[PDB]
Design a protein around this ligand. Structure first.
Ligand SMILES: NC(=O)c1ccc[n+]([C@@H]2O[C@H](COP(=O)([O-])OP(=O)(O)OC[C@H]3O[C@@H](n4cnc5c(N)ncnc54)[C@H](O)[C@@H]3O)[C@@H](O)[C@H]2O)c1
Ligand SMILES: NC(=O)c1ccc[n+]([C@@H]2O[C@H](COP(=O)([O-])OP(=O)(O)OC[C@H]3O[C@@H](n4cnc5c(N)ncnc54)[C@H](O)[C@@H]3O)[C@@H](O)[C@H]2O)c1
Lengths: 245, 248
């Protein structure tokens, strides 16, 4: 069975709750010594603490992916704690609706959080993954990187670059032994903006009939970073119930 | 005929030579009042001059897409001269091969140069186009934006961003009577490119191109005139790809 991560070291950025927290637990159960990592270092310690409870291998760290210094620390910490880096899940990020006349700080920040971050980390992680003989990079994109809508300037155009970054950098680090893929999630039960009348709307145009649950992405991350996705690269697997939200 | 820009006002960044030249040069003969702009200040003026020379209305001005001072200056300086804004051609842009380990300074700059700026100017002209009833914004992408190859991270993902921005902000300025399009151009045999091109490379770039010739700056401009004129009045959000059916 190829859906495992035996003898693997995985950084997961942004993994204190939600998808990150989920990818972390799932990779740790898959057999990977997880470097849990978030901006809020205590929940990051808890997720890594939790994985330790269940018999897993993990250390929990602080890392504002937007902080170059933090990136180089996390990268250094992983090697100092597990000896190698073979998997990186760039899940930290975010976004939302903004007006067309939004302030640019909001704008440029999105490409710092959602793109600049994960590209730089991929740069820092790449040569180590090479030494191990190969690795895998997973960028958590969004359905906004595909979709087309009002008030979607920043959140849309940012995450569409992360897709198309994923497509191309595969050609760069492919030769070093590295796969690069992307998961574009739909809406996830992760809630302050949710109400049952918006729900039926969100559930319109969603063929599978439900919103998402973070183990949905987490399950897809395991696949795309495991040997079951061993010849897969340059891709963007959209997990959104057959629809938009 | 609807392939015209009669009594329109077009801010056209990056327009001192090559493409942006032929855009601003073509929009001229299409009865447009052009604001020829480029980061060389003489370069824009020299072009507005030949336009005025051949029959046109055009003022030469200096703008650095990646400079806010220059952006707010171009909106007003066009308005003060023609009253209104009806066309914004964000032809100013850049990029090319870059190794994977490139310095983050290079990576950010291509976004500053290709996205952020474009987006900002188009924030600016959008309520002034709204006064004139409506207009057309045009971005210049690149086949880097859909294509995938080695050393394309900065060049490729940024134009990609440009593209899907075009796809999304058209829902925003779409009710303001504005339409957003973009063109991904293939390789354009310009004067700049010719001087570092060669027949043996050109033959390489061209095999796997079905039409069998390089692009030329007018080919982008013909498409730019169509996309900005009423002859595409119900066309918006689009990313038209002028590359002869292939990649280069
Ligand atoms: N959850 C969704 O509905 C949804 C939908 C589409 C796309 N996404 C994508 O998933 C990713 C995150 O989804 P989410 O809802 O789990 O995220 P979120 O923003 O709700 O936060 C999840 C975790 O990310 C951490 N985090 C936030 N900023 C960080 C930073 N600068 N550095 C490190 N960690 C940080 C938080 O501490 C938190 O534990 C984003 O990249 C987003 O584009 C999510
Ligand atoms: N082969 C091609 O020419 C080709 C192919 C695909 C896409 N494009 C796109 O066309 C656009 C540029 O065309 P080009 O290749 O002739 O570029 P270029 O560099 O050859 O010249 C374009 C003009 O833009 C001006 N310029 C440069 N930086 C500027 C700035 N910060 N502000 C304002 N003006 C500036 C330059 O002076 C130049 O005259 C870019 O968006 C590029 O991505 C070009």
């Amino acid at each position: 069975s190829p859906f495992h991560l035996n003898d693997a070291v995985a950084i997961v950025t942004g993994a204190a709750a939600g998808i990150g927290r989920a990818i972390a637990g799932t990779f740790a159960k898959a057999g990977a010594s997880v470097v849990v990592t978030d901006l809020k270092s205590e929940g990051a310690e808890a997720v890594a603490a939790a994985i330790r409870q269940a018999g897993g291998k993990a250390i929990g760290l602080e890392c504002n992916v937007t902080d170059e210094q933090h990136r180089e620390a996390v990268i250094k910490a992983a090697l100092d704690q597990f000896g190698k880096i073979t998997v990186l899940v760039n899940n930290a990020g975010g976004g939302g609706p903004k007006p067309f006349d939004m302030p640019m700080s909001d704008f440029e920040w999105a490409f710092k959080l959602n793109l600049f971050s994960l590209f730089r980390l991929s740069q820092l992680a790449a040569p180590h993954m090479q030494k191990a003989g190969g690795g895998a990079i997973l960028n958590i994109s969004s359905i906004a990187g595909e979709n087309t809508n009002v008030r979607m300037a920043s959140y849309g155009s940012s995450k569409a670059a992360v897709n198309h970054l994923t497509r191309n950098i595969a050609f760069d680090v492919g030769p070093m032994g590295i796969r690069v893929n992307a998961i574009a999630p739909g809406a996830m039960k992760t809630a302050t903006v949710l109400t049952p009348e918006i729900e039926r709307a969100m559930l319109k145009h969603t063929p599978l009939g439900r919103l998402g649950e973070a183990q949905d992405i987490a399950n897809a991350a395991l696949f795309l970073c495991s040997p079951a996705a061993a010849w897969i690269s340059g891709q963007v697997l959209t997990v959104s119930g057959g629809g938009v939200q």
